[PDB]
Design a protein around this ligand. Structure first.
Ligand SMILES: CN1c2c(nc(N)[nH]c2=O)NC[C@@H]1CNc1ccc(C(=O)N[C@@H](CCC(=O)O)C(=O)O)cc1
Ligand SMILES: [Cl-]
Ligand code: NA
Ligand code: NA
Ligand code: NA
Length: 282
């Protein structure tokens, strides 16, 4: 029952999408969208932002065609409020806004939230404020509660309209700061599920595994998605066709994945190395 959001219509995140976007290969882009929907996607993340390129021009071109060719809703992945308003114009009732945050302060947070409210769009909110990204359990809860209060009391948004993104960081560099980061998000999600009944939770699941070989990313992403579902995850941004059921993951790979996610270091044992070692050997 997870709302799966296809991740691959993303210029920075997909070479295939980027090349087609740049060449205005509309039918290639629609073919990529349909593949994702057939592989399980109930919605599609759309991030066309690319440095030194015009986001609004790309969106003005693509969005009208997405409105007629797709049935599934679009999650508009942008930090530009004008980009969000284009999507809201061309896809009325078929938009999730990704995202609002508090890094720019309250007025900017309020401007994005007002769009969600005025247009009846679902709203993603990141655990990010004026001091930056929430990496610990404690920071995530603090930022989330501040946002929830504003979203409900001031904008009159319903818990059910909200998707809290408590942030997915790679646990693959192996430095002391990044090792616990997936565990910290999982724990914050369980706590906020109790504190904020009725709110959705979303994660960019693929970020947890950056740097590893593709077969290893597939396993780690799937295990992390599964763990998150148990903590209360309601939606996920994923490569729709590369989510394995837990039962298809070999027992040793599964156990090493959980060790890596929960940072189960001991004397002789580095889970990062052991997880990487498994995929060379098998
Ligand atoms: C940070 N992400 C994220 C978000 N939005 C929210 N709300 N939360 C998030 O965590 N939007 C973008 C990204 C999620 N999307 C993606 C998309 C692709 C890849 C990715 O790993 N791409 C591969 C593909 C390479 C290719 O085929 O070109 C890569 O290695 O970059 C990761 C995350
Ligand atoms: Cl502003
Ligand atoms: Na992007
Ligand atoms: Na402020
Ligand atoms: Na402002």
């Amino acid at each position: 029952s997870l709302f799966l959001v296809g991740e691959r219509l993303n210029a920075t995140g997909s070479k295939r999408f980027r090349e087609m976007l740049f060449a205005r290969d509309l039918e290639g882009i629609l073919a990529l969208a349909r593949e994702q929907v057939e592989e399980g996607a109930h919605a599609l993340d759309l991030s066309v932002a690319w440095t030194g390129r015009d986001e609004l021009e790309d969106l003005r071109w693509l969005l009208p065609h997405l409105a007629t060719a797709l049935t599934v809703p679009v999650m508009v992945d942008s930090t530009s409020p004008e980009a969000m308003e284009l999507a809201l114009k061309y896809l009325p009732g078929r938009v999730l806004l990704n995202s609002a945050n508090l890094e720019d302060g309250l007025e900017r947070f309020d401007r994005v939230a007002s769009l969600a409210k005025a247009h009846g769009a679902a709203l993603v909110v990141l655990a990010i404020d004026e001091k930056g990204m929430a990496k610990t359990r404690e920071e995530k809860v603090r930022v989330a509660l501040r946002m929830y209060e504003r979203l409900t009391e001031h904008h009159g948004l319903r818990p059910e309209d909200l998707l809290f993104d408590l942030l997915t960081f790679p646990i693959t560099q192996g430095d002391e700061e990044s090792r616990p980061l997936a565990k910290e998000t999982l724990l914050a999600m369980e706590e906020l599920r109790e504190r904020l009944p009725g709110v959705g939770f979303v994660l960019g699941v693929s970020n947890v595994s950056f740097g590893l070989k593709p077969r290893a990313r597939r396993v780690l992403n799937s295990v992390f998605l599964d763990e998150a579902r148990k903590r209360g995850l309601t939606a996920a941004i994923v490569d729709a066709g590369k989510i394995l059921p837990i039962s298809q993951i070999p027992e040793e790979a599964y156990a090493l994945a959980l060790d890596l996610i929960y940072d189960r270091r001991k004397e002789g044992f580095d889970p990062l190395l052991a997880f990487m070692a498994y995929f060379e050997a098998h």
